[PDB]
Amino acid sequence: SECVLGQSKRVDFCGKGYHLMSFPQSAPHGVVFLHVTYVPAQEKNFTTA
Amino acid sequence: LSRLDPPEAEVQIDRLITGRLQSLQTYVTQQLIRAAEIRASANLAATKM
C-alpha cells in the first residue's frame, strides 16, 4: 500500500533506486514485488559559475 | 532419578523435564523483540539510509 498503490518517496523501501512504479505478483505463501527505478549510468564533469 | 524412586518420583518428574525448556522460551522471546525491534529498526535505518 505504499509501493504498488501510489508513488512513494522512500528509497530502500520500494526497491533499489528512485522508485517509479510497482508490479505485484502472487506466490505460494508469498508476495513478490517487481520494481522500476530510475538509476542513471553515464556522466561527465561539468563546470559552474 | 537415583534417590527418588520412579513410582513416587514420576509426579516429581511430571513437571521437571516438562518444564525446563520453558526457560529459553523466556530467552528467545527476550531475543526476537529486541531483534525485531532492530529488524524494524533496520527499516528505520532504511528510512534515512
Curated annotation (Swiss-Prot), chain B:
Function as written in the Swiss-Prot or TrEMBL entry: Subunit of the fusion protein that is processed upon entry into the host cell. Mediates fusion of the virion and cellular membranes by functioning as a class I viral fusion protein. Contains a viral fusion peptide that is unmasked after S2 cleavage. This cleavage can occur at the cell membrane by host TMPRSS2 or during endocytosis by host CSTL. In either case, this triggers an extensive and irreversible conformational change that leads to fusion of the viral envelope with the cellular cytoplasmic membrane, releasing viral genomic RNA into the host cell cytoplasm.
Effect noted on mutating T47I: In strain: Gamma/P.1
Organism of this sequence: Severe acute respiratory syndrome coronavirus 2 (2019-nCoV)
UniProt effect for mutating S2A: In strain: Alpha/B.1.1.7
Name of this protein: Spike protein S2'
Parent-protein start and end of this portion: 981 to 1029 of 1273
